Design an enzyme around this catalytic site. Sequence first.
Site, short mmCIF file in Angstrom:
data_model
loop_
_atom_site.label_atom_id
_atom_site.label_comp_id
_atom_site.label_asym_id
_atom_site.label_seq_id
_atom_site.Cartn_x
_atom_site.Cartn_y
_atom_site.Cartn_z
N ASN A 200 -2.11 -0.68 11.44
CA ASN A 200 -1.60 -0.02 10.25
C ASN A 200 -1.85 1.50 10.25
O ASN A 200 -2.03 2.11 9.19
CB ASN A 200 -2.18 -0.65 8.99
CG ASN A 200 -1.43 -0.25 7.74
OD1 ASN A 200 -1.65 0.84 7.19
ND2 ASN A 200 -0.53 -1.12 7.28
N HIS B 214 -0.01 3.59 7.37
CA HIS B 214 1.34 3.06 7.53
C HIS B 214 1.81 2.39 6.25
O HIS B 214 2.96 2.55 5.84
CB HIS B 214 1.38 2.06 8.68
CG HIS B 214 2.76 1.72 9.14
ND1 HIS B 214 3.38 0.53 8.83
CD2 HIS B 214 3.65 2.41 9.90
CE1 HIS B 214 4.58 0.50 9.37
NE2 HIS B 214 4.77 1.63 10.03
N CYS B 215 0.90 1.65 5.62
CA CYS B 215 1.15 1.08 4.32
C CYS B 215 1.41 2.16 3.31
O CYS B 215 2.25 1.99 2.44
CB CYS B 215 0.01 0.17 3.84
SG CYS B 215 -0.14 -1.22 4.91
N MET B 216 0.69 3.28 3.40
CA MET B 216 0.72 4.28 2.33
C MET B 216 1.90 5.27 2.39
O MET B 216 2.04 6.12 1.50
CB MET B 216 -0.58 5.04 2.26
CG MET B 216 -1.71 4.25 1.67
SD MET B 216 -3.18 5.26 1.51
CE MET B 216 -4.10 4.71 2.90
#
Lengths: 403, 406, 402, 402
Positions: A346, A391-393
């Site tokens: 991530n 990556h999530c953010m």
Amino acid sequence: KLGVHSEAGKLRKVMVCSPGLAHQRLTPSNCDELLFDDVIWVNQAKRDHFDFVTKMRERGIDVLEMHNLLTETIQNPEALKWILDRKITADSVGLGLTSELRSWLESLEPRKLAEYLIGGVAADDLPASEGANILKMYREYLGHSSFLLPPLPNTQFTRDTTCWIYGGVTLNPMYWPARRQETLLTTAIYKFHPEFANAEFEIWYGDPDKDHGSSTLEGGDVMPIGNGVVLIGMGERSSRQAIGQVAQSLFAKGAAERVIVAGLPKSAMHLATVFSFCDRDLVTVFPEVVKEIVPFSLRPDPSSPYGMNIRREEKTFLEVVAESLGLKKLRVVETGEREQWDDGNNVVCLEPGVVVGYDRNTYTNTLLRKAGVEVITISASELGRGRGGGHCMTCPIVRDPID
Amino acid sequence: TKLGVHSEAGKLRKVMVCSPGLAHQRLTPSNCDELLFDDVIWVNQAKRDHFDFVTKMRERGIDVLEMHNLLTETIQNPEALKWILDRKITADSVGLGLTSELRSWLESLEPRKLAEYLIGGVAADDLPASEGANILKMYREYLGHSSFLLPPLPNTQFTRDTTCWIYGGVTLNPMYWPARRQETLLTTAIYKFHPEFANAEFEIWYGDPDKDHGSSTLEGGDVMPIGNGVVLIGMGERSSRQAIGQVAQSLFAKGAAERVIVAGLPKAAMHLATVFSFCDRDLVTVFPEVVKEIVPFSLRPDPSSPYGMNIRREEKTFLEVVAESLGLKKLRVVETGAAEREQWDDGNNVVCLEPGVVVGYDRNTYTNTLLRKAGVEVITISASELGRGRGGGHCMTCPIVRDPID
Amino acid sequence: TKLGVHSEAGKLRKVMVCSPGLAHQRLTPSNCDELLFDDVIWVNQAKRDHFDFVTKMRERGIDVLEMHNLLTETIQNPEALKWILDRKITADSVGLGLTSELRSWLESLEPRKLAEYLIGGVAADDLPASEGANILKMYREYLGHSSFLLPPLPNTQFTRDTTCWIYGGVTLNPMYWPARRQETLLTTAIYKFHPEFANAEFEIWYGDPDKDHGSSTLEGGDVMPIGNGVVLIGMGERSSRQAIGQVAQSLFAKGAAERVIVAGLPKSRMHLATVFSFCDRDLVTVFPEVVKEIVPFSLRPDPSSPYGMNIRREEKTFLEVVAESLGLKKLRVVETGREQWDDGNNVVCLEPGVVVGYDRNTYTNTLLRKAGVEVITISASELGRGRGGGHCMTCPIVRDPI
Amino acid sequence: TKLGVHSEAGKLRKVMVCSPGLAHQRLTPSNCDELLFDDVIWVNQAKRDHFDFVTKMRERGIDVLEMHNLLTETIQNPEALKWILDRKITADSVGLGLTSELRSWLESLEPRKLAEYLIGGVAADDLPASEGANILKMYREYLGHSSFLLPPLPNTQFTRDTTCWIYGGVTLNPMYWPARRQETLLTTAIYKFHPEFANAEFEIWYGDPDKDHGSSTLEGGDVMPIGNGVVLIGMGERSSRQAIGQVAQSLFAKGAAERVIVAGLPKSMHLATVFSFCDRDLVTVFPEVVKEIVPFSLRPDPSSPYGMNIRREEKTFLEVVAESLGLKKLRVVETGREQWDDGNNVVCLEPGVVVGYDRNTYTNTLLRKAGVEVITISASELGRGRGGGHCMTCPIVRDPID
């Protein structure tokens, strides 16, 4: 020009969403109700965020903060009518405070409104009243939720709720109850705001006005890795009813030429949460999940009951992926010798070989930097317990291909 | 015919039931928690047990309508079948691999068997050999996914909270769990299409399998027409205020009822009919640790306000409020699940056939004795399998015709 | 000044503490499930956080003693090491095939290291190539087993729970959980052999690493010598009436205490000091939800009773009883869980009116200053994902009468 | 006068069951979790199903012993009573306040019932009025705390678990959950004082209620004496290698058996729970887990320190087992057309004749296909106990086969 044409390519324009009000309302008691692992310390999560945000601006990447986007957008009476028109009903607010709540907001600064549209609206935030004050009796005597408008502490993971996929985007029918109110606000942005109202781009799949049923799609699970290939994590939070539908839309507009479907083991997660590109030919991987992924290729073929065909790939995910890209081998740094435990997946790529990861995955981060990767670090003290990574953010709106 | 529910105790004349079946045959110790049932049951026995409890009532003059029979009956009018298939079988529900294949199949079945599948789901298993269905077979086997084209509804069994009859009308309930919404479609279907309901005269106070509803969730167990133009609606886990708020003003708007008493449930687990159930004009059972924690709200009609409703909070105990509402000095109350309780048991959720005549579980021998002491006739049936459903005579019944008191 | 803790708010002279170590490096999401820890932590970061904490105490006088540290020194006494090893290293615990191997390698150990492992624990890959360890290495990888020969004690970090001091004397606590029992052995063998403790005067009121205690548990978090001959113990949770009865009885028999107040807590599943803590002589913070439920009882001596005492129920609020108990008029209480949720219980008293808390609890820490209280802070980000605050992270040894 | 179990399939001769008792009466939804029972069963009806069971064996010439009768017979010998009480009743379990009352009470009781209470527990209520007991009721209501002077043992109904017979020796097992070690004591005593035992011949390979057994935890359900010196033993989350190894090293050194196949279980069961015998070479399994277990052959060895060697096997467990019974391969029925059932945990009254649950129609049919007579008991109640006949029985005397 908008379009993410890869994962590793050069990043130019990303959306993101600092923590803030939405989270200020969190509470051990309300955590799970609210879909967020652990009560964070908001003030510092915001510092750390903007911090990560800066290391990205300081590279000449245009960072859009949902919060501004939202604040601008609602400076257009029509859009705002548009959000409110849908966001305040007898069914979500209650028939006893539809007019109360509406006018209160309508009657606040451009900024204080966007805050609430995300962080939510307690009864408390309203001026005395009969009704506001039955909802206070409720939360008080029996401890019901006192939420007129529920917070969206998951807005801060902008990756999930929309996907830029080549020359176009999806409006995502989210998994869990709470997040479904997310996709709306972001629609209103893409729909009204001046950097998109003008933008040339198609809407591949999605629409916050339909009910999508069993069909769910989450950004995490979507990977446009170029060459017209889309990775889709299927199984956990993104479903066949949803996928196979994007599949056909993409296909039916010359967006993409083949989706590769990553079947994720159930027996919670997202593709990128166990599979993350860092370089043209390198990926971070959570072993134990990946080595049990089952590949399937959707492809346009006019002789299908739907215009699609599906093979079971004969190779492991990593092999199938390896080819789809024009490679033979995939450099793999598996996380999940070892100092202690971290998960270094991530991570987000700013460019071919440039990665932002956490100030804590120290083992992983030197392997990454041992595979010839530059690792920008950010702090995982608070943003980290949100179980989200870089990556999530982020939400890429503009990223280059790698020819 | 004049359909309506005018009490909790009145002479019961018409009930809807649904027996366990293909739905519960599909249960497994690992698919059973996402399927929203508590434990795998001996389906073949649950049936014998349920036909017992259905028969015990019928043998007493009461019309009992089996959901499966009703659907099976409805399933015959092609307008109806169509009307269900169009909203059950679609891309978002089934996907584009399967709709045609699936419905094409479905419609090729004999009617009875179509309603079986309609209540109990359909796995890839049951569909004819197909490119399509195999993917799903191979998604299951290989990736540990579910084969469920249409998903089983083991809870239908619990016809009580899938739709309420509040006096001269019924509510089409917007279920709590995204698992049980699929249910309402079917009952509605029956109410709209089945000879018995189509010709009948009754209102539709609140609801629509065709509108989303969002936070508005109303479950029947939470709803109690106690007579005397009052409605008790429990507000806790399953029944939200948005729904209660509406079913309220719809009731008032047509002089269906005068007063709604929101039973304020603390933190949000089980229905109101679960700690509090009626027995006679003036008797009730009570899970005391919960009852005693309710906060009663009186919600009446008001031309004096925008939304023509006014809501005050009441200092008397819920039991008291309810007493007052029936013009009653106060309720006789038997508590269920420390004295000479030989073993723990929960007596609540017993159904009234008629005042002083009631159905409960065999096993609840300590409670059912008090019930007797306090002068009720208690008919029993086997808890062994039905009761592991976490639900008794009440939950398992959905009254359609019940006389008022006095 | 003899060893003794004679208050909660009073001047803090000597405390013991234990920083994140090898035990925490072993935490991975799949096992902090069963090692009584909420999350996996940056360990390097936590050590910093904990040291800061340390300094901040020391730089004010306090004689801070670190477990690892005192245990290292202790081990250097051959007799002591045998004591420990004869007990930590059995065939019931480690196992037939691995008792020699694992003991023999441990004694090859340089002390700072040997102790690193006593708290941190041994998995089978710290071991010399071997046949017996390999079937372990074997067991854990194929059949997904606990490979640990000696269990990691992440919780020693919370030095208050494994031992209390109660005026002139110490109880070595029979922990509740199994993830923690081990812990006391080590602290016991310290007080017992270590130079510092081995020689001066103090009593053992309760507890014995050797004895099998049964349904008797007592965790330090639950025993506050508020001073004035009074001792509150919180019962019903980790701390069971079977211990409490007995702690009380030995306390009366050796006249450490005049009265024990059982702050009987409502069963749930949280020590007393995670819901009610002292900031001042007349000051406490307080998780109102739990406190307002506590039902106080009063234990007293009784020359004439069978068991040496006689307990009776206390009619006023717990809080009112503590109050009237130290002979105050009323305790100023500050609650904790307006701009985000807050829990700031569990601050330790460095002296009257001086406490250590966490930086995240600004609302509550704000009030506290307004209460005439000076608040030193340290960082929760990792130390507080723990499960604990100043009060957990310290075992006072020497603290003045108030 | 001699006893033993030399297979699983041989003509069963002596079995110890225990009927659902006062303890099941004590079960409440909010307590049956910490009691370790999976549902509040309907006692009277479990009681009648269980008997039915008991009888059905009793008719095929089997001598069944009830734990209630035998406990009864035992405690009439005063010394066995003194023997139990002095262990069952201590200040660490009943609490100083009560031992006196509590003990002096039981002693006044008649056998049939005094036993009844051992297996059943005793709450404040049950105690004759006294200042002592009420302050416990006080806690219960006001505070939610248990008020069980003695613990209910509703798992006693599962006798397979507490004690193993293996070839003329028996293990008095150190149970896993704290919530269950209390039985071992009781059975131990019966075997130690009761004329049906104290007089017969047989060894005690592993066990002592007296010792504290650290991680050494062993349960009967994980242990199968299959025939010629092969003992199967699943090592998992319930049975611990720490024992497993002692239990072998005692078996060999005493001539008792020539090999243990440790049945390696995946993380998180009893062996007899996913793998069960119905005939000379007929077993039922549970593929999800039977397919994925890693066996180990454990055999004696003069040429080593601890005097054993463990080779892992590569062949599947099923296979391992076959090659050790000297059979070509294993006939196998898989459970866990109409609906789901786990037909497993069936117990053999002889080779080829077995008692399963009536609900399990499907498996029963395959088993009938496979040439087994299947005597059935009800499941409506005893079934919510998660265990079958294998669980509900303690083979005391059973004939070999080879």
